[PDB]
Paper text:
The [name] enzyme catalyses both the N5–C1′ and C6–C3′ bond formation to generate the fourth ring of the prFMN product.
In an attempt to further probe the DMAP/DMAPP specificity, and explore the putative role of the (pyro)phosphate in Friedel–Crafts C6-alkylation, we constructed [name] (to mimic AnUbiX) and F181H (to mimic O157UbiX) PaUbiX variants. In each variant, the DMAP specificity was retained, and crystal structures of the corresponding complexes with oxidised FMN and DMAP revealed little difference with the WT PaUbiX structure besides the mutations itself. In PaUbiX, F181 appears to block binding of a beta-phosphate containing DMAPP in PaUbiX. Despite the relatively modest changes that occur between DMAPP-specific AnUbiX and DMAP-specific PaUbiX attempts to bestow DMAPP activity on the latter by mutation of F181 were unsuccessful.
Author numbering:
A (entry chain A), B (entry chain A), C (entry chain A), D (entry chain A), E (entry chain A), F (entry chain A), ...: 2 to 207
The structure:
Amino acid sequence: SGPERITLAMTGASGAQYGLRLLDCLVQEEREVHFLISKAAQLVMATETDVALPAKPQAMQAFLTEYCGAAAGQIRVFGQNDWMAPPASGSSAPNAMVICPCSTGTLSAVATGACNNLIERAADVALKERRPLVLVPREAPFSSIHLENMLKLSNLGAVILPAAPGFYHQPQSVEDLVDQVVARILNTLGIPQDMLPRWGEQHLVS
Amino acid sequence: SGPERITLAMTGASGAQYGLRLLDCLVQEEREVHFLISKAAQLVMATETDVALPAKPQAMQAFLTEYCGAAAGQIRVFGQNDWMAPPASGSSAPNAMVICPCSTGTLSAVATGACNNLIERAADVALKERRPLVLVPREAPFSSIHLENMLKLSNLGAVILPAAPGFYHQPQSVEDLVDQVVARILNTLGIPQDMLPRWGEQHLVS
Amino acid sequence: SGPERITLAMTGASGAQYGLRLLDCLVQEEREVHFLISKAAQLVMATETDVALPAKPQAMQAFLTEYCGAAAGQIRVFGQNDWMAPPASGSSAPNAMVICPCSTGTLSAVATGACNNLIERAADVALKERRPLVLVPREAPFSSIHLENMLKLSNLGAVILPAAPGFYHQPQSVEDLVDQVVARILNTLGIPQDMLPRWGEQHLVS
Amino acid sequence: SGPERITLAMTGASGAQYGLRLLDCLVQEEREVHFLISKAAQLVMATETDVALPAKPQAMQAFLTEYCGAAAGQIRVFGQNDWMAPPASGSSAPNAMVICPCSTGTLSAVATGACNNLIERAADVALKERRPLVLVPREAPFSSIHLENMLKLSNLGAVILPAAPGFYHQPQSVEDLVDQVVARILNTLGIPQDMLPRWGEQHLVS
Amino acid sequence: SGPERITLAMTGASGAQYGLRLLDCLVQEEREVHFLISKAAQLVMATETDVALPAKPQAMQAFLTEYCGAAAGQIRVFGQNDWMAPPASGSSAPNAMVICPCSTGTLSAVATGACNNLIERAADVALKERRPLVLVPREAPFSSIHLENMLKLSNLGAVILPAAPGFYHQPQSVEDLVDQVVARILNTLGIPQDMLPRWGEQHLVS
Amino acid sequence: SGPERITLAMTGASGAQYGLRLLDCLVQEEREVHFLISKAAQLVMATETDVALPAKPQAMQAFLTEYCGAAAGQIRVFGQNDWMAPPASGSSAPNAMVICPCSTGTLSAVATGACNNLIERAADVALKERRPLVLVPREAPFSSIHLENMLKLSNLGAVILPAAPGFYHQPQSVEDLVDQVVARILNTLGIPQDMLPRWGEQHLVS
Amino acid sequence: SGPERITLAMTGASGAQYGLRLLDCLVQEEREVHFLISKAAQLVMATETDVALPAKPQAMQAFLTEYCGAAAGQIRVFGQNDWMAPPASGSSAPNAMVICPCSTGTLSAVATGACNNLIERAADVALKERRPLVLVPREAPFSSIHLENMLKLSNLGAVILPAAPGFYHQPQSVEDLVDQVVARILNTLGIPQDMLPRWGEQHLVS
Amino acid sequence: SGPERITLAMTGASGAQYGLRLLDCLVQEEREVHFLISKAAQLVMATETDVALPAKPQAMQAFLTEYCGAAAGQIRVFGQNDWMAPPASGSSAPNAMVICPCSTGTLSAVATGACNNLIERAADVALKERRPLVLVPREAPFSSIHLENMLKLSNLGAVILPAAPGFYHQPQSVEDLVDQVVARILNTLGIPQDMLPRWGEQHLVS
Ligand SMILES: Cc1cc2c(cc1C)N(C[C@H](O)[C@H](O)[C@H](O)COP(=O)(O)O)c1[nH]c(=O)[nH]c(=O)c1N2
Ligand SMILES: Cc1cc2c(cc1C)N(C[C@H](O)[C@H](O)[C@H](O)COP(=O)(O)O)c1[nH]c(=O)[nH]c(=O)c1N2
Ligand SMILES: Cc1cc2c(cc1C)N(C[C@H](O)[C@H](O)[C@H](O)COP(=O)(O)O)c1[nH]c(=O)[nH]c(=O)c1N2
Ligand SMILES: Cc1cc2c(cc1C)N(C[C@H](O)[C@H](O)[C@H](O)COP(=O)(O)O)c1[nH]c(=O)[nH]c(=O)c1N2
Ligand SMILES: Cc1cc2c(cc1C)N(C[C@H](O)[C@H](O)[C@H](O)COP(=O)(O)O)c1[nH]c(=O)[nH]c(=O)c1N2
Ligand SMILES: Cc1cc2c(cc1C)N(C[C@H](O)[C@H](O)[C@H](O)COP(=O)(O)O)c1[nH]c(=O)[nH]c(=O)c1N2
Ligand SMILES: Cc1cc2c(cc1C)N(C[C@H](O)[C@H](O)[C@H](O)COP(=O)(O)O)c1[nH]c(=O)[nH]c(=O)c1N2
Ligand SMILES: Cc1cc2c(cc1C)N(C[C@H](O)[C@H](O)[C@H](O)COP(=O)(O)O)c1[nH]c(=O)[nH]c(=O)c1N2
Ligand SMILES: CC(C)=CCOP(=O)(O)O
Ligand SMILES: CC(C)=CCOP(=O)(O)O
Ligand SMILES: CC(C)=CCOP(=O)(O)O
Ligand SMILES: CC(C)=CCOP(=O)(O)O
Ligand SMILES: CC(C)=CCOP(=O)(O)O
Ligand SMILES: CC(C)=CCOP(=O)(O)O
Ligand SMILES: CC(C)=CCOP(=O)(O)O
Ligand SMILES: CC(C)=CCOP(=O)(O)O
Ligand code: NA
Ligand code: NA
Ligand code: NA
Ligand code: NA
Ligand code: NA
Ligand code: NA
Ligand code: NA
Ligand code: NA
């Protein structure tokens, strides 16, 4: 159940832990992941994590395959101007797409249809083919510009899933909060997860 | 610097830790706090925390005074239908107002001008007097209904500050993430805080 | 085929027969039903029917189980402020939701995102998770306020299915008209029904 | 009291019983009725009723006069392109107009101002002269296209009265439900009726 | 001339004197008054006036009958959840409706179609039946939320009559200013009044 | 996979080759096709192709069955006013619908909800039941009227798929370009096709 | 605290007492007042008050200086076409501006940006420099034209403060009601006043 | 007749044949062409054609001059950041501008006024000087983002001419379809062409 292929895009918002954890969970569920990462997102990961991600796609692809324990060919890495990659065309095989985390800059580009890189093209392709598109914005405060861009995409079928974890399962660590958001993303995709239990499932009567 | 009085309202969104931590920081900065809490928010606090908050205003006021080490009269607690409380009238002394956390239900009420309790009246009063109003929504995903309500209030001068903590200062605990959001709220209010350093302050040239 | 679980909410519009008949059909199709009923809807049922529905959830749950011949645990009844019930959280297992009948007051609450009870929260949750939401309004005339609320929800993916039965299968009783509307609801949910035949199915050529 | 002349238009929505019953009630109240019926509505009446309505205006006029026990000249029947009929011009004597039932196609035509037949012209004339116009739509679900057309006309003064009968007077037959809707239409027109009692008229105090 | 029955609703805005004076004038003009009063409005009347209004409908009805010198059955009082009262249904006998004074909270409820009590239902019924609806808001400043709600209702046919008395007849007391507003309300209803003379009636030429 | 039944409508835009090729591909995938064709579309086919299509449904149905090598009953042809055909009612069995090619006139009718023929009714039914609806407009330039109609339908869930073939697979004939568009339509429907390969499927890394 | 200079404009709405009382309070707080008055406002003052205001600026300035006990140069009076006055240019020293009372005609001019006199220019200058602008409309009913103009200005930062006094401090005279509105204006400006006490200031707990 | 100078911009949409054929036709009509081509468009031309276009402007200019048989100086090639080129300034000599083909990314940039390269600046200049601007989008499906951008530009005077060739002149090759679109572009520019005959020119009477 859920999509066989997922386009996972990481952009330069804080919350690089969310994207890496999502990537790992997708691998453990035996999903094929088309991995995209912006230049600013590489800076964020170097600043916020101890993950030393190689810069070029192929070295990055080999590193990520090792980091998550993925099978050969399970993780595909595509550069930011590789228009020959599957996500660049609606004639490609159907993927679900997640931008996690999603910068306000990338949010604006997708909202206006700017196609300045492969992440922005892939999101444009997902909307025109009405394939799943999940944006995980991380920003505070949300300006009216941010909110109008989120509202326009939400009206068009995209899922605006902010990196705003809930506390209703007594989190004990940063990792508990990261897992909580990733579990919502997996729920939204229809992919099984055991980190976030189904609320009230054994609650029969008030 | 910053407001002498703050109306702190807590509603039934997850993230009760944010409101309690904000209340404590406000007390440490020697601010007078008009504390409001919804019935659903009391359920959330009992579920998510080990804080045993008394139910009625006066017992609640004595408890909170002890819990934060506040001076006598520094924390005022007002019931949900006490229209004689200062926040209910624009002729009151000027306060800043924070709803943290802010449920989508309370977000909707403030956006539409529904005045079904003192929290909703106080927010209506803040907007009509153009006094500061900060909403801290905690929800995921954000629906188009949520986004339209946030956008309308943002256009009217309210600050939409989601409970979406950043990771760019290497958080080591849940408490680090809670402090990060509370620090943004204090920054937005113009109240001093030392939990979140000023970004790039010693960065002279690229 | 169709949803395994359905949140059936009844609100204080005339047409209590529609909701009871839908509940019975859902039970006969071996579906799990999370049953919600407003205070005004209880008054409507007492006025319009000879069904003597018990007031509290558990007594109501036992009564409804007997009334429809349902298996144990097949019908769950949840009170109007039971936030621990599954419908209150998007982290719950996926349900389809039907408000039948839907008052103009509940229509307004769902349109604006007011979350004043569990019915209104559950509808808010369904929209944010993009799970099925069917509203069955019963009102005449429709004001512009009613129509704007229906249009906003329809634009957001909700199904506005008014209690306006068709006559194109020669109805002979009130029960025929009630069955006609319930069959449209079941069709909309993707649940099998034999009360409303498939139009023109054996019509080969003009 | 109420209008002396009524333009009654029937279009190809299910619910031909509503229009025939309304026509009969109007005759019993000694009102002059300008009767219009679309080609699709004639098909609906043949399918849904045992009324064998003649096809051409004059034969149709003689039949309807007999069917309702109307006086000579009380019922006028006008063909779909008879621009010499009173409803086609705002310089005519003032009528109230009812489209019952009203197809979504005719609803769309009136909303956009399309004047492709005499029914659509007459409705255009009623709106420009600000004479009463009641639309009785029968459709389920209501699409956003349907709802936008109803909302536009409602904003312009038309009454959107859906064929959604109430059950709060214990209906015992299809005829009770048909009478309920017709009574609302008569109430809206200001014409006396005894089928639907005045709600709460003898209810002095709670 | 003017309406035989008036639904007079009082809500929790300052200006309780306006509603009591209007009620008295309506009684002196031999009109039947369906009186509704919110819980907050009862607090306002106790604070702003020396009128000791009984709390429950029937005691309140007997008191008001004595206070205005009304005939038996001339004043009907209905509780806030009495859905059996005439104002709750459009099938009732036609009334005009006045909300005086009208809180911003009730203004918001009527604008959005929220039907949380009988006052809000009655206003919803008045708009859908296109029966007169006069709102008398008392608030300062008017926020953009207040203004959008007033504008939406004004566009829908409601009369937005603020408690903003004119001074162009040399008022000598608070009672002169209260009478001035009540006279505008009576003028708007088409009910005779002698408190506010017809402007320029004997002004023949400049 | 994909829909078992497809309503294929052809209207009077240039590009009759697209519709005939789509019809053939649907037959080869063993799908049941409900075929509708406008009067203007018949003129276009006679002008642009050597296909001699019979005028009346039944003769047309026999011809099309032979032309595509379809099984008996696989292709159903319905006249433009046959309201007894399945597409005319939402109570019919679920179909996907394609208008290929789609004139600007039919685009306008579907956008406004005009139901002047069975093609326009069927599209209205598809939108209200939220069943797939694909429009293949052929026009140049696109006016603002055309664009507003396409945008409104796109916002409502319809797929606006213009007859604008891509050249990125080195087309060698008109037939290659026709096949390219038909393949996008089949992709959009979820029906297998081998004319348009999946873009970048074997592209592992940049 | 508060602005050192205030542009006080009086226009031809009823409520000349409000403007004169505001002018006096501003003088008592030692503020410099740039006084503007329309031709219609002069007629209103002659009709509604016993103040005999001289017609030309300089005589008017000497009179007003005596009437309020102001220091020399404290009150400046500028004619309606004196473009050399400070309020006519954004390069002037910063003022706050109040139009009290504000006619619907002047409200319309400021909303649309009409600059037909110095009052309208000064308001245009205040909005473009984002300096305080308070409008005190006096009208009843408010039309939709009035409400749209107020809403547009409110959205742009202007304060719409209607002459709608509250009664929650037991007013005993017309002068009490005039003082109540003037006190709100002074509160809005941030200027000290003792006529309207701070609501609930000594209300510690419910 | 028609413009003496044309700014021909090619962007990275499929349909490079359209732009090359248009360029050739413009040369044959003795027009001066200011040629712009994006980096992505160069990739498209290498993929879709056997044209080996040199990368740098001057080598590209010499190649194109030879490829079309143009006179010296007839084709000017300008790099993507050459702000000294005529198209970058509205003070330049008047040109008509065509973007053929036009990517959805460039469509978005022109719609929002983004000026990230000379193609986008030139289009911004054309709109502000109200000089002709023709966009030739090639995409399928058109998303709502695409459609809103096209509609905004169409409303502003730009011609949205999709690469959607007609078939009503019996095309026999890909080249016939390419010529058909190019002929519409030339018609829109007012430049003579003989590839597309004038429809119905010798059709005297029906
Ligand atoms: C360490 C760090 C942290 C952040 C950022 C930067 C850096 C270096 N930036 C700014 C962001 O990277 C910038 O706007 C880029 O232009 C985003 O480009 P992409 O959208 O990734 O192409 C950023 N932007 C944002 O919208 N939300 C955020 O939380 C952050 N946080
Ligand atoms: C433990 C727990 C946790 C949550 C909630 C409930 C409970 C019991 N609720 C639902 C919320 O309380 C409900 O909509 C109330 O109606 C909110 O009422 P107030 O806005 O506080 O008056 C809730 N609502 C929301 O908008 N965001 C959230 O994160 C949560 N989380
Ligand atoms: C017998 C009877 C019948 C009706 C009602 C009431 C009663 C007692 N009410 C009014 C409705 O109950 C009221 O607006 C409630 O506030 C609705 O509350 P909920 O939406 O159920 O919480 C009602 N409301 C509505 O929108 N449509 C209807 O057909 C009816 N009919
Ligand atoms: C028996 C039967 C029943 C119905 C219909 C048809 C038939 C034959 N039609 C379809 C409708 O007649 C069609 O859209 C016509 O084009 C309407 O034309 P007029 O609006 O009457 O000119 C129809 N249309 C609609 O909007 N609501 C309905 O309930 C029905 N029901
Ligand atoms: C003495 C006093 C005076 C006022 C109020 C309160 C009290 C106690 N309230 C607040 C108002 O009562 C509150 O928003 C209630 O929620 C209104 O509820 P109803 O609309 O009456 O159901 C109030 N609200 C408002 O909109 N305008 C006003 O002038 C006042 N004045
Ligand atoms: C040969 C030929 C070619 C075309 C046309 C006509 C003919 C005869 N028409 C015009 C179209 O047929 C006309 O607007 C009809 O009214 C469309 O009616 P339907 O939408 O099919 O009912 C047409 N219309 C359009 O929108 N796009 C097109 O490409 C064409 N091409
Ligand atoms: C005694 C008296 C009283 C009033 C008025 C007039 C007079 C003579 N006028 C009408 C107003 O003066 C007129 O519309 C002028 O054109 C307003 O011009 P200024 O806006 O002052 O330039 C007026 N206008 C308004 O909007 N509200 C009001 O309350 C009054 N009252
Ligand atoms: C072979 C080939 C074919 C296409 C594309 C690419 C490639 C390599 N791209 C994607 C497009 O080039 C991308 O969005 C660029 O960012 C466009 O940049 P410019 O607008 O030319 O600056 C593309 N984009 C689009 O909107 N429509 C199309 O038909 C195509 N086709
Ligand atoms: C890279 C590429 C083939 C882009 C075009 O894809 P599509 O046909 O616009 O979905
Ligand atoms: C409780 C109270 C005095 C409410 C009225 O306040 P305001 O004058 O509307 O700001
Ligand atoms: C009762 C409860 C857990 C509400 C919060 O749910 P969600 O995470 O907002 O979908
Ligand atoms: C048939 C006729 C006279 C139509 C014109 O009427 P009107 O003057 O437009 O109201
Ligand atoms: C209390 C009651 C009968 C509510 C329903 O009234 P209506 O038919 O919706 O006008
Ligand atoms: C031909 C026909 C039954 C039309 C009515 O269908 P629906 O119930 O409006 O979906
Ligand atoms: C009277 C005058 C200088 C008007 C121009 O002022 P501004 O520079 O437009 O603020
Ligand atoms: C390169 C250049 C002169 C840009 C400015 O042109 P314009 O005056 O803005 O039309
Ligand atoms: Na770009
Ligand atoms: Na309320
Ligand atoms: Na609430
Ligand atoms: Na016509
Ligand atoms: Na309600
Ligand atoms: Na029609
Ligand atoms: Na002027
Ligand atoms: Na730029």
